[PDB]
Amino acid sequence: GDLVGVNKDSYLILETLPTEYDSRVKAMEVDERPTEQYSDIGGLDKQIQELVEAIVLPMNHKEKFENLGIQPP
Amino acid sequence: AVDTAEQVYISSLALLKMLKHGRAGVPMEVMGLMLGEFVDDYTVRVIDVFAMPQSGTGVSVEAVDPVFQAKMLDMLKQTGRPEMVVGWYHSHPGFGCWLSGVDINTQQSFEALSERAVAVVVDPIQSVKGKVVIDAFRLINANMMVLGHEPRQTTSNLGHLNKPSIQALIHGLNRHYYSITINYRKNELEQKMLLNLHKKSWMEGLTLQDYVVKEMLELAKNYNKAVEEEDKMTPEQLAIKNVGKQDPKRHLEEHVDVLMTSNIVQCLAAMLDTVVFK
Amino acid sequence: VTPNCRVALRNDSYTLHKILPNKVDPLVSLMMVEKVPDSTYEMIGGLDK
Amino acid sequence: AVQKVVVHPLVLLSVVDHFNRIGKVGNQKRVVGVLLGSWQKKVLDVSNSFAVPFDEDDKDDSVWFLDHDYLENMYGMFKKVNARERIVGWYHTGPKLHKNDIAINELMKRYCPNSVLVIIDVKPKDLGLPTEAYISVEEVHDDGTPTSKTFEHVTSEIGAEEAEEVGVEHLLRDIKDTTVGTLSQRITNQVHGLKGLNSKLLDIRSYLEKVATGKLPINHQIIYQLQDVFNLLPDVSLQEFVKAFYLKTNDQMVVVYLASLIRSVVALHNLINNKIANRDAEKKEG
Amino acid sequence: EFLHAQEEVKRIQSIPLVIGQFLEAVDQNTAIVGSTTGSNYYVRILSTIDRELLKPNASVALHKHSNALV
Ligand SMILES: [Zn+2]
């Protein structure tokens, strides 16, 4: 399932294309990254806390999880 | 300053290197140079068709290696004969062997230096013995349309080259192109030895080899009974009483002569004991 | 030149060369899809009106 | 262990035009050259070769000339057209040999697993075979001397590979495919009877001249050993093959029964519709 | 030349035989054949085949170049 360069004559697999960009997905990747600090989230600050303990710390420190030694969420 | 019906006294090895150059010359089309001798005006001869490297990039005028030219002719100098080029060959083994759009450029690119430089088109993948697709063309040009394009001086050679005149875009390319005549040389200095190795080789070699015999006949006699009941359905098919039949559907033969020469082989095969022994 | 009749066209220069007297559609595949012959009236018996 | 090769007569026709070179370059009589090819099997094919500018002193016959301008860079050309068609051996004309040949083999055994010398024929009038191979052999003796290297009679043939008869069988312009039983068998009768029994006269040249003037290979190791094979059936008066005569009733049994019944069927074949179409053509003419 | 005619019939055959289908027949030994290439042809057909074997749109053998019913 790859885009490859093939000779018209010998029909030899010549090179791999650097053009496998994948329509819609690579367009689904949000590259702008709009800003939102946590000052906008008013009223769900406990959900900010369990949110960070659930999600943000598995990105940073799995040693926080696996020196205790169970699993990430 | 004058136009004459030409002729190509061909070295059989030319066509040999073309049938190798198209047989092994995988039908991705290729290009070469033709190495003969400009003998005179009303004929020309080829004495050599040499080989080209794997130019698997493209039929082009740029595919010629001039150091392979100079070293090639140099290797003709350290061998006996340093003959002269007369033109160029190429191969069209895939399609119906007609003049490609590089030939319409590299022809006058080559004959700008040469005199004639006749094209060579080949396709050995046409047939095995029946069709001999050798092909050759002389590019006439729009400069020579002042005179009519009629050499004609000896005729019936281009009258019998005129006898086919059937290739689709080439019939169309009557403009800019008139072919050349190619006979085959009286090659009995080699056709003699191709004959003597031909029949000294291809019939039991030393010929004390067949002199298989009778289980072939066993199988052949079961053939030569097993078709005999359906061979004899034809006299039932001849029982039309008055007339009711078109062409007799003659299955009389194909089983006479098989028995004939096959059992000539069985009876001289019966002789070979009293022939070999005494 | 008959309108919508078919011809024999060469591949040479597409020279309009011969004209072919023909029928056009699947006519063969179903045009002649009859039950040919069979038998006579004697095996009917009753629906004669 | 070589039975046969496939011989393309293309570069044999290059032996023909180098046979045209030697008639006009001078003193060099014999056409000597170097054989390209590829070992695939015991069967082999030769598709190309090349003919060497070679000289050979009649005094001290082992004086070779295989130029490496002529060898190496031409092997770069012949490699450049095809990586497959490299060397396999070499050739020269004459039937027997050349006091230099063995050394000329060893110049290129550094190039090939088995550099073969195939002694070739420019003027075929032969009673036996065409060009024939000679493989690297070390048979020596039961003696324990230094190793013999003279390259022994290892059978070959003229094989035919592929189509190639768009030229060839157009250039026949004479010959017919005989449906054997149409004289081709008696052609083989003349060639194996005559061309076999004059080779038998070469064998009385052997077994008379060796009795006369023949030294050490008079009875080296194959004469009595194949006097065994001569002693299949050489016997005196009529050799008395008493098994072979009612065994021959079991033989001629078959041929005369097939000819009898089957040629009576041929009597139907010829006779019956010969009469029908005969008298249709005869009295239906009126 | 009788044998040349006979052997000649099958030189260009049986090795790389393409498959099309019959369509129609105008006249003797020349007919209309559709193809598995997608297009239709009107080609000269042989004297080899029995003439009553070409009722349906049957699977037929043709040459690449020449495209002849064999
Ligand atoms: Zn070409």
XYZ file of C-alpha atoms in Angstrom, chain D:
286
model
C 31.189 -34.553 -16.953
C 30.173 -32.759 -20.176
C 27.972 -34.514 -22.721
C 26.953 -31.704 -25.036
C 26.725 -27.975 -25.634
C 24.414 -25.756 -27.675
C 26.241 -24.242 -30.623
C 25.038 -21.092 -32.264
C 26.589 -20.920 -35.753
C 26.522 -17.115 -35.523
C 29.995 -16.739 -34.074
C 30.932 -19.793 -36.085
C 30.178 -17.474 -38.970
C 32.548 -15.136 -37.176
C 34.973 -18.050 -37.516
C 34.013 -17.890 -41.190
C 34.896 -14.235 -41.619
C 37.964 -14.590 -39.465
C 38.672 -17.500 -41.755
C 38.348 -14.690 -44.299
C 40.806 -12.650 -42.211
C 43.548 -15.307 -42.145
C 43.458 -15.794 -45.914
C 44.382 -12.138 -46.407
C 46.496 -11.128 -43.390
C 49.284 -13.550 -44.277
C 51.183 -16.553 -42.935
C 48.627 -17.602 -40.299
C 46.957 -20.725 -41.626
C 44.891 -21.944 -38.692
C 41.944 -20.007 -37.287
C 42.426 -19.862 -33.518
C 40.031 -18.075 -31.225
C 38.509 -17.687 -27.778
C 35.097 -19.118 -26.945
C 32.596 -17.164 -24.880
C 29.741 -18.838 -23.028
C 28.167 -19.783 -19.722
C 28.100 -23.034 -17.774
C 24.496 -23.694 -16.909
C 24.636 -27.469 -16.627
C 26.433 -30.412 -18.236
C 24.575 -29.071 -21.259
C 25.796 -25.604 -22.159
C 25.174 -22.915 -24.725
C 27.633 -20.861 -26.713
C 26.137 -17.595 -27.931
C 29.278 -15.587 -28.720
C 33.075 -15.935 -28.995
C 35.981 -14.035 -30.545
C 38.895 -14.958 -32.797
C 42.362 -14.060 -31.632
C 45.240 -12.471 -33.579
C 47.531 -15.389 -32.880
C 50.931 -16.574 -34.035
C 52.595 -19.919 -33.523
C 56.218 -20.770 -34.222
C 56.745 -24.065 -36.011
C 59.981 -24.389 -34.014
C 59.103 -24.693 -30.300
C 55.367 -24.920 -31.047
C 54.424 -23.564 -27.596
C 54.562 -19.849 -28.496
C 51.149 -18.279 -27.806
C 49.752 -14.829 -28.522
C 46.597 -13.926 -26.602
C 46.971 -10.166 -26.271
C 45.414 -8.596 -23.202
C 44.642 -5.406 -25.006
C 42.740 -7.900 -27.139
C 41.586 -9.790 -24.032
C 40.798 -7.453 -21.145
C 39.203 -4.420 -22.772
C 37.368 -6.595 -25.271
C 36.132 -8.520 -22.259
C 35.029 -5.113 -21.005
C 33.097 -4.595 -24.214
C 31.737 -8.128 -24.227
C 30.937 -7.674 -20.561
C 29.462 -4.258 -21.345
C 26.975 -5.644 -23.859
C 26.092 -8.564 -21.586
C 27.146 -9.613 -18.126
C 25.997 -13.151 -18.939
C 28.072 -13.942 -22.043
C 31.538 -14.190 -20.582
C 34.291 -16.668 -21.505
C 33.903 -20.433 -21.379
C 36.936 -21.586 -23.373
C 38.651 -21.252 -26.746
C 39.012 -22.862 -30.170
C 41.324 -23.599 -33.093
C 41.001 -25.455 -36.383
C 42.617 -28.661 -37.565
C 41.321 -32.024 -36.400
C 43.917 -33.229 -33.920
C 45.676 -30.603 -31.734
C 48.510 -28.093 -31.223
C 51.640 -28.468 -29.054
C 50.648 -25.178 -27.422
C 46.948 -25.894 -26.799
C 47.239 -27.138 -23.204
C 49.184 -24.016 -22.170
C 46.643 -21.872 -24.012
C 43.979 -23.584 -21.919
C 45.794 -22.770 -18.685
C 46.017 -19.078 -19.557
C 42.260 -18.871 -19.181
C 41.552 -21.500 -16.537
C 42.262 -18.621 -14.176
C 39.176 -17.072 -15.779
C 36.804 -20.037 -15.829
C 35.834 -23.026 -13.641
C 36.310 -25.148 -16.746
C 37.917 -23.476 -19.729
C 36.989 -25.816 -22.559
C 38.919 -26.204 -25.790
C 36.555 -26.960 -28.635
C 38.596 -27.784 -31.720
C 36.677 -26.379 -34.637
C 36.120 -27.123 -38.314
C 36.322 -24.505 -41.058
C 36.013 -27.011 -43.932
C 33.574 -29.807 -43.067
C 34.129 -33.059 -44.886
C 34.005 -35.213 -41.790
C 32.946 -38.825 -41.205
C 32.132 -38.372 -37.521
C 30.973 -35.242 -35.736
C 31.394 -31.461 -35.917
C 33.295 -29.372 -33.352
C 33.745 -31.256 -30.089
C 34.635 -30.367 -26.507
C 37.571 -31.216 -24.265
C 37.200 -30.596 -20.560
C 39.801 -30.126 -17.841
C 40.995 -33.608 -16.900
C 43.591 -35.035 -14.492
C 43.655 -38.736 -15.367
C 47.402 -39.161 -15.073
C 48.077 -42.907 -14.731
C 48.277 -45.633 -12.098
C 51.872 -44.464 -11.915
C 52.190 -41.536 -9.534
C 53.949 -39.080 -11.842
C 53.332 -35.315 -11.964
C 49.781 -34.575 -12.965
C 48.699 -35.009 -16.572
C 46.721 -32.110 -17.971
C 46.150 -32.927 -21.683
C 42.466 -32.395 -22.182
C 40.586 -35.552 -23.056
C 37.718 -36.365 -25.410
C 34.698 -35.101 -23.509
C 31.691 -35.384 -25.852
C 29.823 -32.374 -27.279
C 27.349 -31.601 -30.072
C 25.863 -28.813 -32.189
C 22.800 -27.854 -30.208
C 20.080 -25.523 -31.464
C 18.645 -23.181 -28.841
C 15.849 -20.883 -30.013
C 13.846 -19.535 -32.926
C 16.473 -17.826 -35.111
C 15.227 -19.421 -38.367
C 13.492 -16.331 -39.732
C 16.956 -16.113 -41.205
C 18.036 -19.750 -41.198
C 15.049 -21.645 -42.536
C 14.413 -18.859 -44.961
C 17.983 -19.417 -46.123
C 17.304 -23.126 -46.645
C 15.994 -22.564 -50.182
C 16.449 -26.257 -50.998
C 15.590 -28.679 -48.235
C 12.431 -30.626 -47.326
C 11.205 -32.025 -44.022
C 11.081 -35.723 -44.912
C 8.384 -37.833 -43.262
C 10.969 -40.506 -42.332
C 10.331 -43.596 -44.363
C 10.939 -41.435 -47.386
C 14.615 -42.180 -48.120
C 15.986 -40.243 -45.123
C 16.479 -43.628 -43.498
C 18.757 -44.766 -46.321
C 20.690 -41.512 -46.026
C 21.283 -42.588 -42.444
C 22.114 -46.021 -43.863
C 24.889 -44.575 -46.002
C 26.218 -42.384 -43.214
C 26.226 -44.943 -40.432
C 27.107 -47.940 -42.573
C 29.691 -46.145 -44.661
C 30.712 -43.451 -42.156
C 30.727 -46.024 -39.373
C 32.677 -48.725 -41.132
C 35.336 -46.433 -42.505
C 35.755 -45.459 -38.871
C 36.102 -49.207 -38.426
C 38.860 -48.906 -41.026
C 40.364 -46.256 -38.762
C 40.077 -48.917 -36.091
C 42.049 -51.348 -38.216
C 44.464 -48.459 -38.671
C 44.528 -48.488 -34.884
C 44.690 -52.219 -34.383
C 47.109 -52.733 -37.256
C 49.344 -49.655 -36.992
C 49.624 -50.055 -33.223
C 50.639 -53.671 -33.795
C 53.059 -52.283 -36.387
C 54.582 -49.091 -34.954
C 52.455 -48.262 -31.971
C 54.205 -47.671 -28.681
C 52.876 -47.392 -25.066
C 49.191 -46.537 -25.855
C 49.105 -49.806 -27.839
C 47.436 -51.326 -24.778
C 47.491 -48.572 -22.173
C 44.171 -49.126 -20.410
C 41.246 -49.143 -22.802
C 42.071 -51.492 -25.659
C 41.375 -54.784 -23.907
C 38.867 -52.970 -21.690
C 36.867 -52.165 -24.794
C 37.808 -55.423 -26.433
C 35.245 -56.484 -23.846
C 32.750 -54.225 -25.527
C 34.063 -55.597 -28.793
C 33.349 -59.004 -27.190
C 29.662 -58.281 -27.065
C 29.282 -60.290 -30.301
C 32.335 -60.822 -32.590
C 32.082 -64.636 -33.003
C 33.478 -66.788 -35.751
C 31.248 -68.592 -38.242
C 27.808 -67.000 -37.915
C 27.908 -66.146 -34.128
C 24.927 -68.530 -33.457
C 22.290 -66.270 -31.891
C 19.960 -69.208 -31.222
C 17.897 -67.295 -28.648
C 17.539 -64.457 -31.151
C 15.788 -66.489 -33.847
C 12.611 -67.539 -32.066
C 13.121 -64.364 -30.141
C 13.103 -63.110 -33.734
C 9.843 -65.018 -34.181
C 8.664 -62.854 -31.269
C 10.057 -59.907 -33.247
C 8.930 -60.440 -36.836
C 5.771 -61.740 -35.197
C 4.809 -58.141 -34.570
C 5.930 -56.539 -37.840
C 4.360 -59.119 -40.130
C 1.142 -59.292 -38.119
C 0.813 -55.504 -38.210
C 1.745 -55.408 -41.897
C -0.642 -58.255 -42.679
C -3.803 -57.085 -40.906
C -3.005 -53.383 -41.156
C -2.042 -53.463 -44.794
C -5.255 -55.320 -45.477
C -6.853 -52.287 -43.834
C -4.726 -50.235 -46.248
C -6.310 -52.415 -48.924
C -9.616 -51.003 -47.821
C -8.021 -47.495 -47.729
C -6.679 -47.544 -51.270
C -9.003 -50.058 -52.927
C -12.492 -49.021 -51.838
C -12.736 -45.273 -52.349
C -10.223 -45.637 -55.153
C -12.968 -47.585 -56.916
C -15.765 -45.223 -55.844
C -14.126 -41.948 -56.859
C -12.640 -43.843 -59.799
C -15.919 -44.826 -61.412
C -17.615 -41.609 -60.411
C -14.874 -39.818 -62.337
C -15.131 -42.437 -65.069
C -18.770 -42.968 -65.918
C -20.096 -39.794 -64.384
C -18.009 -37.981 -67.017
C -20.557 -38.918 -69.702
